[PDB]
């Protein structure tokens, strides 16, 4: 019971491994209903058992790839490989690579700096209003820390060089840096073997693969002008509306009627789909291709427009409250937000106030008119009649 | 557009001030309905405008004081002072002080280590199953980083010394360490001036004071055997049940009947109150005296017991879903959880699975039967019909 045993100081790396929850989410098993992509079945809603932290280190690299489309509009493809037997995940993107040159301040090559050193980012200057998902300078290093092997390969024609270096043992050591002359099409490829012992797992089982695959479909549905491949197979997704259809296709309410779906691409930064829900308020949303599974002010900003307008209709007739109207809604929101803020590194809840979004999302009078007639008002009027 | 301007590395301290959101919450104004204690009406539900990050650095020090009751059960009092004119907040507790001695490993005095160095804590050894709120070793340093002046004073009789040192300019520099002989009642007092420029605030206005005051009432209601004083005024709270009453005050539902309250202190680590909600599912919960404003598995663990039993009854008299039963519930939970986990440093959502709680909270059949007899089952049986 000595003072030095009671009061302890931890390094940054030690703290991440000792307290992973605020960095990557829970490292313990979770059992809950999720949307997944099952082989031969597609998008479906079922109970899944998985470790959030493992899902998240995959997500960090995948979002980083999508971020490059904002950095370089010439980027066109993301290629994802998932090899459960060899415990191997690879994420590849074209467009401009990372500059392969020595950082004059930190005195090391840039790819080694931003992948092997904590708190390193190109998103630290918020005078630039960016719609990338990267914000904090942790993501890629967290995947590195929770991998037994983590390899960065990036090629920059501008610098006429290609970079390749491997980290091992939870970013505890690095292999040899490979520099080669390069004069081809730029690319970046991140290949890592997740440290499954950190997650009390033995392999990338059916459930986590089904989640990682559905996440690849998310990227295909949330980005623009980006082809997404999964294990060499192109994913058949064209726009957010076709992605949303994969959830609603052939769904029926309890009475037997097909779900009425209201859609509007409000502008180049907002796309909204609205249908009816029988299990309370449901939302599926994305901010800068991040799956905001706890929602955020972008979801409230869209849903509160619909709720207030629907409440005004029930008030002409018939005492109703907004939460009663909201529990009949299932909304899909794909948004591009400038310099978003979140509650945590996992970025599941987007906290930025609408006045700082950098854009607006006023639903058309056509959308609202289609929403007053989607049966939500009918399901509220029959309740007041009781 | 040079490489060194594009790709930058930040120190831990720089990152906290540059990206405060994951550390303390939003540093921008928020307008939402909150429970506050106003100087003329008391506990009431109204719209408030405040900066979460400023509220949180107050919460970090306040929860630290409550943690000391777990460290030293002989501790009995917390005294909080809020002086808006001089921008001065102090949080004082009795019980055992911090050991005043040089840390043999980090080579500095213990209070200077755990208040002036990031990632320093007594809660890093999870072989000890503790029910304190502190987990990550950030809290006090974050308040320090977001203050223009931050002073730590703690007196340890065991070491017969008293410690006092001041940090200034967002923990950018530290004053002189003052060591004096001590032989009185142990205490710890944290006094800080919040850096209102970091929060774009001109003063500690009515709304942020009302929030800080209600939080002191939370501590008085969530802890055991702790008197809480605010500006020399004792808070009249004795136990969790009396605290919950301050919210309901015999107020009436939409029909005009007084709200029926079902209560059970299941054991020494769980106390639950259940009434009726007319605005959807409401929860007011605490884990190790932390206000878990986003809920967590401690709330699900309690609420789902009620939901499962109420669903079992409506099926006997008949298609029902769990969310419809839950949207009529307003639940209060005061829980002590071993080594809890949360989504973020703000600890608003408690993520630990029930199998790691260190205790159980199985509601008595009397409590369940008392829940079967509220209007929740009645308001649902007629709807399915
Ligand atoms: N696929 C990629 N192509 C090009 N640059 C990349 C790629 N992935 C990462 N980077 C760069 O590497 C930096 C570090 O990535 P990362 O550690 O994820 O931090 P971040 O994305 O900026 N912020 P965050 O993910 O919120 O912690 C990024 O800021 C980019 O500049
Ligand atoms: N009022 C107090 N009385 C006694 N010890 C205290 C007091 N406040 C803080 N401490 C000690 O100082 C340490 C540092 O506090 P803090 O920075 O808040 O980290 P923490 O409470 O351990 N975890 P967290 O608050 O979740 O980041 C605590 O672990 C306690 O051991
Ligand atoms: C700890 C994991 C957090 C998470 C990540 C994720 O990736 O997905 C999730 C989904 C989900 O499967 N989806 C579908 C597509 C992407 C998305 C954005 C927002 C909300 C939900 C979802 C979900 O489902 C709840 C029932 O609906 C619940 C949670 C998640
Ligand atoms: C960013 C601020 C987070 C927060 C801190 C806090 O301190 O309070 C809150 C309350 C609140 O006022 N209370 C009452 C007492 C303590 C508590 C525990 C859990 C939940 C809620 C609350 C609240 O209200 C929601 C509508 O009810 C909503 C949020 C908070
Ligand atoms: Cl978040
Ligand atoms: Cl949290
Ligand atoms: Mg990133
Ligand atoms: Mg603390």
Numbering used by the authors:
A (entry chain A): 28 to 345, 350 to 417
B (entry chain B): 28 to 345, 350 to 416
Publication excerpt:
Topoisomerase II (TOP2) enzymes are essential regulators of DNA topology during DNA transcription, replication, and repair. Topoisomerase IIβ (TOP2B) plays a role in transcriptional regulation and is expressed in all cell types including post-mitotic cardiomyocytes. Both isoforms catalyze the reaction, where one DNA duplex is passed through a transient double-strand DNA break in another DNA duplex. The ATPase domain of TOP2 is highly conserved between TOP2A and TOP2B and is composed of an N-terminal strap, a β-hairpin that is unique to eukaryotic TOP2, a GHKL ATPase domain that binds and hydrolyses ATP, and a transducer domain that conveys mechanical motion to the DNA binding and cleavage core of TOP2. Here we describe the development of the obex class of TOP2 inhibitors that bind to a previously unidentified druggable pocket in the TOP2 ATPase domain to act as allosteric catalytic inhibitors by locking the ATPase domain conformation with the capability of isoform-selective inhibition.
We co-crystallized the ATPase domains of TOP2A and TOP2B with 5c and the non-hydrolysable ATP analogue AMPPNP to identify the 5c binding site using X-ray crystallography. Compound 5c is clearly visible in a composite omit map in a binding site that is over 15 Å away from the nucleotide and dexrazoxane binding sites. 5c occupies the same binding pocket in both TOP2A and TOP2B, located at the nexus between the GHKL ATPase, transducer, and the 22 amino acid eukaryotic specific β-hairpin. Compound 5c consists of a substituted chromene core connected to a tetrahydroquinoline moiety via a non-planar amide linker. The chromene ring is buttressed between a Ser/Thr of the transducer domain and Met of the β-hairpin. The tetrahydroquinoline is accommodated within a hydrophobic pocket of the transducer domain. Most of the residues interacting with the core of 5c are similar between the two isoforms (R241, M61 and W62 for TOP2A; R257, M77 and W78 for TOP2B); however, subtle differences including a slight shift in conformation of 5c in TOP2A relative to TOP2B are likely associated with the non-conserved S320/T336 residues and a shift in the orientation of a GHKL Tyr residue (Y82/Y98) that extrudes from the top of this binding pocket. Interestingly, 5c induces a slight shift in Y72 of TOP2A compared to apo TOP2A due to packing of this non-conserved residue against the hydroxyethyl group, while the equivalent C88 residue in TOP2B is located 4.7 Å away and does not interact with 5c. The distance of 15 Å between the compound 5c and AMPPNP nucleotide binding sites suggests that 5c acts via an allosteric mechanism rather than as an ATP–competitive inhibitor. When bound to this site, 5c acts as an obstacle that would block the conformational change associated with ATP hydrolysis, which provides a mechanistic basis for TOP2 inhibition.
